[PDB]
């Protein structure tokens, strides 16, 4: 089904109507009315520091590594978070901890390399690496953006309460 967007007598009434449109700029005045109208509408802006634009639970934001309630870090170095990262951001090398368990000696997410796809959130079997809510982690130096296991684990501890609430809200969906 198609439609003609712009597909198209001369009477004094008509012409006089058209001439007035050109002479007294009638349509131009119409446009001014629209903007005057909004001037009276409430502005939609938010005080940025005081009020924050709403983000729902799936917002990917900043990477964090979670820990079991007991205190044992969740990651068991299966290293498929490294395998599915599209940007090659996550670098993981591991060795058996004295406990005999399997843990990552080095876990480095290069956030400048990361494109925040959220697949790592997806891929982890123990769900140790999660996309944390925080989006405000702008840093003065490039090195700060590169993150080792200690920063991510620390990021995980700081935001664990909200991360747990967010995963709680969205796990049925996944």
């Amino acid at each position: 089904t198609y439609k003609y967007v712009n597909k198209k007598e001369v009477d004094m009434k008509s012409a006089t109507d058209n001439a007035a449109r050109i002479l007294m700029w009638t349509e131009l005045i119409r446009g001014l009315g629209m903007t005057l109208s909004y001037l009276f509408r409430e502005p939609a802006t938010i005080n940025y520091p005081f009020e924050k634009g709403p983000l729902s639970p799936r917002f990917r934001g900043e990477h964090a590594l979670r820990r079991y309630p007991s205190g044992e870090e969740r990651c068991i170095a299966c290293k498929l978070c490294e395998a599915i990262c599209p940007a090659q951001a996550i670098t993981i090398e591991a060795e058996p901890r004295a406990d005999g368990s399997r843990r990552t000696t080095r876990y480095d997410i290069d956030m400048t390399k990361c494109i925040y796809c959220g697949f790592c959130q997806e891929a982890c079997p123990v769900d140790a690496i999660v996309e944390g809510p925080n989006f405000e982690f702008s840093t003065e130096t490039h090195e700060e953006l590169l993150y080792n296991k200690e920063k991510l684990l620390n990021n995980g501890d700081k935001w664990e309460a909200e991360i747990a609430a967010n995963i709680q809200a969205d796990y049925l969906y996944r």
Partner: protein
Amino acid sequence: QLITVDEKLDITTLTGVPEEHIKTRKVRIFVPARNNMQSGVNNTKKWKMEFDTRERWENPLMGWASTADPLSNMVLTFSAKEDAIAFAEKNGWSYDVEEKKVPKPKSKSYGANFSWNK
């Protein structure tokens, strides 16, 4: 009408490779063997030619591996030994082909081991 040239197609001059990596790079044409870990043979079918391995120094800031050799991760796959040899000659890389070695036929029969004699 066609013209005659006995010159081995060498197109090293058009490929656009830095001089150092055309005269110092030896590539090996080999059919990949099978990780003994798995018994599947679908990765031992096509010939591959792989450039010689180069420096992989540790990075001071993060400890990540760092490489200065561009042709390192490149492994081209060629269906037959003849075609792979051709790629090396026209691109000017040195080649050292390794003959495919396929498992020799082995005679097996469940009845044979039941032989107390042997």
